[PDB]
Every structure is written in structure tokens, then in C-alpha cells.
Design a protein around this ligand. Structure first.
Ligand code: 122
Ligand code: CA
Length: 223
């Protein structure tokens, strides 16, 4: 996250870290045995880490659980990142309390102007790299579809939305992919892509979760 603030330990209780020997993507806990992330974060041998604040120090609230299966969206296109969403089922259910809790899926799609909370352990610099060990947060608004398509002509589909600042300085970044965009207590987006990070007129682009609720619910119900 570039230009964000330190969230504070376990203040984002649905945030997970996907680990394959190291943190490589974020994710959101949607129930005690399922995590939603970005399809471009897919790989085999994923261990889901819940209750994390400092990903390099075991502080006491962590739950490390392996994935039993991953399901990438049937229409995911890795060249355009359209339908960039995946589901991960945990080998055992996590123990939910105040520091590890699931986030609700939305009943309605959020509108431009909505302020949301984006979080992750991604790079905090726009030029250069500095990866933080504790969770960073950013409050940002969803932008109009007009501003979004104008910033990325020919690349935005109906399954994506932009959120951020056209002025730059604040954005999600590499290492934040797969994480949550929560607006009014509902998971409305998944950190998906951007052109660099925090650059002027290049806001972050997110998977529009409201368009996948039926698929998520039907998938969980049968697996
Ligand atoms: N600017 C942004 N909002 C952004 C967000 C997530 C990203 N994730 C990446 C990324 C880059 C290389 C490999 C995987 C990634 O998720 N770039 C990203 C950029
Ligand atoms: Ca830790």
C-alpha cells in the first residue's frame, strides 16, 4: 500500500496472507473454511495465514491452515485479468473471534463515491521497494466508471472498478493483490491490477465482487 497508515494489530480481522514459503498475496476470509483472492494469485502449495499483523513474527493470534482446494473462476482470462477472482477452501475450519472474523459478501454493488478500506502487506513505495512487515491500510473512494475507462482505455470490463486518487500518491501495490476492498462492512472488491503504483491518472483496478455472489455461494454450497 503506498501512502497508507499502519492499521494496528488485528483491526482488519478478515485479512489473510497467502504463503508458499513467503507472503505473495492477500485474501479475505468469507466464512470459517473459505477464502476469496485474485485468480492471478493462484499457485499450488498455499498455506493461508489468518490473525496476522507482523508476517515475520509469530505474535500470538495466528492460525496457519493449508488449502484443500483452489477454484479459479471458470472465465478467468490471464491476459486481460477479466474475472480475476478465486476461491480457496481450507483443510480445517478456522476459529472465529474478534481478531479473526469473516467479512460479508455484498447484496448490492457499491456506487462511485463510496469510501472503502483497502489493506495489505504490499510495497509502500511508487519508485523503489520497501515491503512492510505489518499490515497497512488505505481509505479510498470508488471512482466513476467514466474516470476509470478514461484512465485505462480499452482495458476496463463490467467486472472491474477503479478506486483511488487520480492525483496519485495513494494506491494499493505489488504484494497487495488478492486482498480486500471493504465498503460499509461488505467485501466489494479484490485488489487486482494497476499501471505501476500511485502514479497520477493511473488508479488501482479491482475485481467487482457483487457480480460474483451467485457463483461464490453456489460453489461453496457444493464443495
Ligand atoms: N497499482 C495497483 N493498484 C496494483 C495493485 C496490485 C498489484 N499487484 C501487482 C502485481 C505485480 C506483479 C505480480 C503480481 C501482482 O499482483 N501489481 C499491482 C498493482
Ligand atoms: Ca505474525
Amino acid at each position: 500500500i503506498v501512502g497508507g497508515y499502519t492499521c494496528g494489530a488485528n483491526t482488519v480481522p478478515y485479512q489473510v496472507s497467502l504463503n508458499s514459503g513467503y507472503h505473495f498475496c492477500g485474501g479475505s476470509l468469507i466464512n470459517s473454511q473459505w477464502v476469496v483472492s485474485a485468480a492471478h494469485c493462484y499457485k499450488s502449495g498455499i498455506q493461508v495465514r489468518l490473525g496476522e499483523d507482523n508476517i515475520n513474527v509469530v505474535e500470538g493470534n495466528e492460525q496457519f491452515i493449508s488449502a484443500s482446494k483452489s477454484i479459479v473462476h471458470p472465465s478467468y482470462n490471464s491476459n486481460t485479468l477479466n474475472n480475476d477472482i478465486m476461491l480457496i477452501k481450507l483443510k480445517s475450519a478456522a476459529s472465529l473471534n474478534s481478531r479473526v472474523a469473516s467479512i460479508s459478501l455484498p447484496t448490492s454493488c457499491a456506487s462511485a463515491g463510496t469510501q472503502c478500506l483497502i489493506s495489505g502487506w504490499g510495497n509502500t513505495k511508487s519508485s523503489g521497494t520497501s515491503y512492510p512487515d505489518v499490515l497497512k491500510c488505505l481509505k479510498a473512494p470508488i471512482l466513476s466508471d467514466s474516470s476509470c475507462k478514461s484512465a485505462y482505455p480499452g482495458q476496463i470490463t463490467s467486472n472491474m472498478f477503479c478506486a483511488g486518487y487520480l492525483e496519485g500518491g495513494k494506491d494499493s501495490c505489488q504484494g497487495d493483490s488478492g486482498g480486500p476492498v471493504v465498503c460499509s462492512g461488505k467485501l466489494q472488491g479484490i485488489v487486482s491490477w494497476g499501471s505501476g503504483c500511485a502514479q497520477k491518472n493511473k488508479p488501482g483496478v479491482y475485481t467487482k465482487v457483487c457480480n460474483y455472489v451467485s457463483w461464490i455461494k453456489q460453489t461453496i454450497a457444493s464443495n
